[PDB]
């Protein structure tokens, strides 16, 4: 009958966040030794994005898996290590993220 449309299964991005006083406006969840956010994945996922915050205006979304921040790779990283990587972030934060659809 009819055909399925072209679909983007997964995606990798870079979103330059410009932290205005008050933080990035997001919450992270997961880490090596923590309860996975998706399946058994121990990555650093974005658990919230305060709308009209810095990270929202930049394109970040809930569930985006945080891979790298300003040249620092979060591969196998614990939670607090991803917390401290983002606390010395500076006024400009370039993250590499990963996503799924729906």
């Amino acid at each position: 009958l009819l055909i399925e449309p072209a679909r983007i299964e997964e995606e990798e991005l870079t979103l330059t966040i410009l932290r205005q006083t008050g933080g990035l406006g997001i919450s992270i969840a997961g880490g090596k030794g923590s309860t996975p956010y998706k399946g058994d994945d121990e990555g650093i996922f974005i658990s919230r994005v305060s709308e009209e915050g810095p990270a929202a205006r930049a394109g970040v979304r809930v569930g985006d898996k945080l891979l790298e921040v300003n040249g620092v790779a979060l591969q196998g990283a614990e939670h607090h290590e991803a917390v401290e990587a983002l606390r010395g972030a500076g006024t400009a934060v370039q993250m590499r993220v990963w996503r799924e659809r729906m």
Partner: peptide, 8 residues
């Protein structure tokens, strides 16, 4: 058990 969450 271990459920972590941190505002930023």
């Amino acid at each position: 058990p271990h459920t972590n969450e941190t505002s930023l």
